[PDB]
Amino acid sequence: REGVFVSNGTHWFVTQRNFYEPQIITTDNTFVSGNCDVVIGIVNNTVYDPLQPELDS
C-alpha cells in the first residue's frame, strides 16, 4: 500500500522507503490487482490474513 517488499533469509517484509521497518506482509498491509502471469519478477509467498485469527473463535 506504501513503501516496498523486502526479503530476509526466507521471511518477507514490507517497509517504508526511507527507514527500515520490517512488518509482516498482511492483507491490510497490501492490495490486489490482477493475476500473476503478467508481472515481471514476481515471487510466490504467503500473504497473512488478520481476519481468520479473529473468526476462529
Partner 1 sequence: ALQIPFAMQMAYRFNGIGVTQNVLYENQKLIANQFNSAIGKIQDSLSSTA
Can you name the residues that pair with 36 across neighbouring β-strands? none
* SS3 label, residue 4: strand
Which partner in its own copies, partner 1, ligand NAG, none is near 53 (CB below 5 to 8 A by kind)?
A: none
Which partner in ligand NAG, partner 1, its own copies, none is near 41 (CB below 5 to 8 A by kind)?
A: partner 1
Binding residues for ligand NAG restricted to 1-57, rule: CB under 6 A: 8-11, 44
Examine residue 46 and tell whether it contacts partner 1 (CB under 8 A). Answer: no
DSSP track, 5-48: EEESSS-EEEE-SSS---EE-BGGG----S-GGG-TT----PPB
Interface with its own copies (CB under 8 A): 51, 54-57
